[PDB]
Amino acid sequence: YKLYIMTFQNAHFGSGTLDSSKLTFSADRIFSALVLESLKMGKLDAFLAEANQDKFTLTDAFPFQFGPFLPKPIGYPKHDQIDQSVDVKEVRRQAKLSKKLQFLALENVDDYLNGELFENEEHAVIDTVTKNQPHKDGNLYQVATTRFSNDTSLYVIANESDLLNELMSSLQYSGLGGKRSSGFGRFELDIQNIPLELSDRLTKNHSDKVMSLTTALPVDADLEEAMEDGHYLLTKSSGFAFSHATNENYRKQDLYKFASGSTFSKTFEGQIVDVRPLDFPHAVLNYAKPLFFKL
């Protein structure tokens, strides 16, 4: 499998509320875009039977600035791995920056566990604008933008085949998150040849102090042993559904999954949960497959 490289600028990626926005984005945001364009193109009965093929998976948002970036491990270092806090004045001034850290570089994935505390590089500044609506007198909303600079890209790793190359190629001329009606979500698809020789520790078999990402959800069956002696971080993601027959826009059920970079100790399974409020002619399904890293 290969990987896709794309960048964003002057876009919008909300989180929780329409007026609020963040830098990265969840993993289920990409999967919800390929299904919408499959019915419009003419292959709805072909993309549904491809995502549930086990070997086909997706990733979350990862920055790309002169090298790939990886999230920090949750829980590391522990109380014994970290150095002894002899002087509390010199430890509290550097331990707070590790909690607010976003992502780590590709050359610091092996030295962070031995003792390395530094400030993360600033990706982009948060910019916001304002609009209104004349001929109404009674509407004033606030929206934000994600204007990236200093060469900031958000690559994605998927399973390259003879059908995926024709699906995500037309996505750059559309939108992905934020105000799509204005033109927030366009990117530039860039393909290469030989992937990175360093980030090749992705497997789904053994479980020897691994770490699952992509903000996946564990299976409903095995959970007592997988969650035991582990860590996670609950998030928040909800919203209305996409349909054309219903005239009420029902609110979908929330799916408080985990976060990226959560360490565990047992191989998960990764199933497909069905979320249906009342009734819909289509089918709302969740993806987010876990990906383990050897660390």
């Binding site: 419009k40 604008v129 109404k136 009606s181 033109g183 054309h244």
Partner: protein, 212 residues
Amino acid sequence: TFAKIKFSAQIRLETGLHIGGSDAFAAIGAIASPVIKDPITNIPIIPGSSLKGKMRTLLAKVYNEKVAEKPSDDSDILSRLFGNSKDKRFKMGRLIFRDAFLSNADELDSLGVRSYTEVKFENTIDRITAEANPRQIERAIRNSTFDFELIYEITDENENQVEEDFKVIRDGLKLLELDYLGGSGSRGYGKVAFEKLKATTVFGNYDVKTLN
């Protein structure tokens, strides 16, 4: 069946206009009407939301079938080009804009200019006294190009009014050239001109029909 029709053109400003934004933002003083720009570089960029609310307003008065009382409800023959929250036959439209940036900086610096925007002095008469409220505004420069992107796509299922939709987009872009664009254009500040109006297909499914 499914393709992306891109109308690559160059918006040449024949007259300096003005676009308002947030108070005390993208500048240093909340006076002389601060023009919104780019948060990274000092390039007066134009937002894509101004072209969505202006092109649809001027379109609902030449090709409509219902009294335009509120957006997403005025008629139906033109609501499929932007969006509609009440109708359920279609979710959004078939036109996507983009924040055009000033790409005329490759040759503007050779002439030797100071700033990209200037301050204009205006006032008004209260019809009973002399000069009333000596205000001031901020305008941009003319003879500047912009990279405008007009993406058009078909929904395959409703592939029957393709030729009917081409005469509407061409008429909407031509009518915009004969009217102001932005803000405070009643005195003669807007009036743009879509220079080099050409179309291309970057996909491989639908051939090029017309050019202008």
